[model samples]
Target: LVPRGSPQQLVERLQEEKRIEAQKRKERQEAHLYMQVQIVAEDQFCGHQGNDMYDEEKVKYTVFKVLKNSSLAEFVQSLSQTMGFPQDQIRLWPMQARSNGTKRPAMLDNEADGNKTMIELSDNENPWTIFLETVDPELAASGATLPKFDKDHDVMLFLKMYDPKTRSLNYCGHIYTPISCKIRDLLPVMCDRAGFIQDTSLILYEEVKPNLTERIQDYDVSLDKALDELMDGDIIVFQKDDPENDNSELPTAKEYFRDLYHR
Candidate 1:
């Protein structure tokens, strides 16, 4: 009652399926190169409202598939489609993730340089990130120079400003400033962002610990010296000077801390 050729047919069919699977994988490898890259807007590099959470979660990246031999111009077109911006309007700068989890953008211009950058990034096993700026077509034609990170002079800091009247802390976002700049150079921008009057006096405090803060009163000196106590990811607090009572209330989490210390 046993079938004569059924077992032989089944074995042949299994072998055929395995051969087809291997061929399909080979074709996929030849036709596509997959890479994981992160895209960040230029605004994220500056200190701005609503970007606090973004700085904390620097863990997002997108997987891109392109031809292994495609020119960077073609890649830019594909990126434009993916990013929903015009090809001519988008500019990309490759970023390197450095020590202490900071990203620094590299200077790359023209197609050949960008092609080499992409090639090197693809050759490496680690994922890479790119900083993208959407330039207006008019501005691009006029040759307006865009701001680039100055490796020798720029210092990135996360600022936390405290509002005493509301009795709450405000996360002001990541601020990048020149190392040689003084406190007065930053007061106008910081005051506006912190929701304080432009003319009011301001104080800078370095968060020594989660519970302790130390005042930085060297306003006349450059930031390299003024922020001498800063460490990676340190929170620098900005407080408005009290009209009548300076240092009478401390910026802390304790209940009634201000009431007890108020003069």
Candidate 2:
């Protein structure tokens, strides 16, 4: 027969095992709670450009679509309330454009009719602009080497959310081709959609860490996956993440620009 103390010891042992198992389960769950690329939307333009043109008819609207079940809708809704814009006036795609820009008048044009139309501004001045703009002369001067907007390709705007505790969202910023025309094209649209911006600051980060960029590129991860990993705060080491060590190193943003310009 077992000793009387043997049963009590077994009970304690079982409880300890259960506690460890619960902890492991929790760790796994937290690991999986990283950011995911909820949506990818495109902003398109349908207008003509000329030398120094300033006619209302010559202006075209910057139209975009918001993915369903994404944080974008919530962001827009919150922005609308803060901006004193009627929620109904702020049209989402699939719903008709308040002002389709070509008809008797879309919602925006109607709003414009009473001089209540909100003028759109550049990403630097629009709360809704996905990419934050830099105001530093040094950074702005580097614009010559930055990404240029391509009229042929829709600007790929990625909306991402990260763990609120990490404050990663504050580091999230826009990257794009730096074509002046492209910037001009998007500015007005975002301004109209969002509202006036109260601040003009670059994205917050510890430093200009090129190694992080290299690590990201070396992983050969898709944008969606990278976004997910980043949001989760995964430690992506460059040399470690690359499967192929052919010395075909990843390009820095500057390097990318140099390649684009054949510099």
Question: Which candidate ranks first by lDDT, i.e. highest?
Answer: 1
lDDT of 2 at 260: 31
What is the C-alpha lDDT profile of model 2 across 54-99, one tens digit per residue? 1234443333333223343444455456544444434321111112
Candidate 2 C-alpha error for residue 195, in Å: 29
**Could you tell me how far off, in angstroms, the CA of residue 20 lies in candidate 2 after the best superposition?**
77
Please provide, for model 1 over 120-148, each residue's C-alpha lDDT reduced to its tens digit, 9 standing for 90 to 100.
64456345566676654577677655445
Estimate candidate 2's alpha-carbon lDDT, on a 0 to 1 scale: 0.28
Count of clashes, each model: 0, 10
Work out the TM-score per prediction. Answer: 0.51, 0.19
Error of 1 at 181 (Å): 2.4
lDDT of predicted model 1? 0.59
Worst 10 residues of 1 by lDDT: 45-54
lDDT of each: 0.59, 0.28
